[PDB]
Ligand binder design. Structure first.
Ligand SMILES: Cc1cc(O)ccc1[C@H]1CC[C@@]2(C)[C@H](CC[C@@H]2O)C1
Ligand SMILES: Cc1cc(O)ccc1[C@H]1CC[C@@]2(C)[C@H](CC[C@@H]2O)C1
Lengths: 10, 245, 241, 10
């Protein structure tokens, strides 16, 4: 998964 | 639900509270600019602003109601527009200058330091001048920026499937609320009914030029990447790769 | 001046009367579509529509008040947007299809014939679907198209000059008055009025987007010698670079 | 030449 994906959860 | 119950005043304060911080540049004012050093500063800044933007987006009423996928689409489509409108707002009271950061205030000629960037500076400056002459208010600014986030990418949502149609309609409901908010602010400022409608139209038509600047900026940033003038962060690269051009 | 004197009803009828005709394509169905031939049809059509657009622009209240230099800039900036909004208007009653001409009705799969064009067809189709969902009216359409003409290039124009911009914004305001007046007549509540106004104007942002992408696509087709563009078309395309 | 410029005059 992309970085943007991760930041939107964290 | 939830964001649709907010009052006009509640929408404003919610947006004001969600506002991201004004980041500083690492710029060392003792050293003159090179093409590479300026691109480095500007892209380093944008990269750090993106992290805050993502957390700001989550604080925009109704945004977290959307699927993870849709949130991604909206940000991927709107990130550069959001950076740009922020820039023009910060630079509003500095005619002829672009305040990327409190310690990085660039005038149009310094845009020549980088190939093809001065034309983009010109567009940003003209936008700041338009805001300045309209006497754009902070409460109006936050409304416009949230509108960009929700609106820019909504038209490219894959329809079909129940969930998708429900997403688009939620986005438009929230967009209507922000419109109600903008009008509320203008009515509160004492503008007549006719003046409110005219100002609203004036503000929204600017977003069309902001979209234009983003498209042009994306092409420039992409050209810079390919010519290997500047090393871009992984995040910045993926956001750039979402526009696939 | 005089455009600023126009009533809402006068503004509407004037714009309605200025509407350009619907043109036919030189489509010949005796030969199969190729990337080159489809680009040929579309660009041939666009070229002929341009001539009518230019004359249409002259009939948009306040346009001929501007310098010839500013008229050129506006059209150079908004031409593809104007072609696109007209296209999506023609296609409203044809779900899943784009009515470039009465004899040229294309679906997204036919867009696949040209490299990178289906993405543009998809965006246009979604815009057409949005208009259909909003139940866009003819009077509203002509107002939106004239707004695009006057607005798209105004931000890229100091001297006076500063007067050219002010005049443009005055006329834009008059069209805003016209749109609202239209919605009021239609029976929309005061609240629905400014909500719809916003919805319609926000679509122009996506139309600008489509134009930017379309300009890049048309440019790449040119740079690969896929299709010979008319001198007029080459100049319009050249204005964006 | 400038066809647009000329077309606007005609
Ligand atoms: C607009 C903006 C606002 C910011 O807060 C930060 C950065 C930027 C720009 C600055 C110029 C660029 C480096 C790219 C887009 C086009 C150029 O490549 C990003
Ligand atoms: C939108 C449109 C409306 C018209 O009435 C005519 C033509 C066009 C397009 C059709 C697709 C293109 C050939 C170019 C722009 C991008 C493509 O290259 C022009």
């Amino acid at each position: 998964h992309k970085i943007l994906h991760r930041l939107l959860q964290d | 639900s939830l964001a649709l119950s907010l009052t006009a005043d509640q929408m404003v304060s919610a947006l004001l509270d969600a506002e991201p911080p004004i980041l500083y540049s690492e710029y060392d004012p003792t050293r003159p600019f090179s093409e590479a050093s300026m691109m480095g500063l500007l892209t380093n800044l944008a990269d750090r602003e993106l992290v805050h933007m993502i957390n700001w987006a989550k604080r925009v009423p109704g945004f977290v109601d959307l699927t993870l996928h849709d949130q991604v689409h909206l940000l991927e489509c709107a990130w550069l527009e959001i950076l740009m409108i922020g820039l023009v707002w910060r630079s509003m009271e500095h005619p002829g200058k672009l305040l990327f950061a409190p310690n990085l205030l660039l005038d149009r000629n310094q845009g020549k330091c980088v190939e093809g960037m001065v034309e983009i500076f010109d567009m940003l400056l003209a936008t700041s001048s338009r805001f300045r002459m309209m006497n754009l208010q902070g409460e109006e600014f936050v409304c416009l920026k949230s509108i960009i986030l929700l609106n820019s990418g909504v038209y490219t949502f894959l329809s079909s499937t129940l969930k998708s149609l429900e997403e688009k309609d939620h986005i438009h409901r929230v967009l209507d609320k922000i419109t109600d908010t903008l009008i509320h602010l203008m009515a509160k400022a004492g503008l007549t009914l006719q003046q409110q409608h005219q100002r609203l139209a004036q503000l929204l038509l600017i977003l069309s030029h902001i979209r234009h600047m983003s498209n042009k900026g994306m092409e420039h940033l992409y050209s810079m990447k390919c010519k290997n003038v500047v090393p871009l962060s992984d995040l910045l690269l993926e956001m750039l790769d979402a526009h696939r051009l």
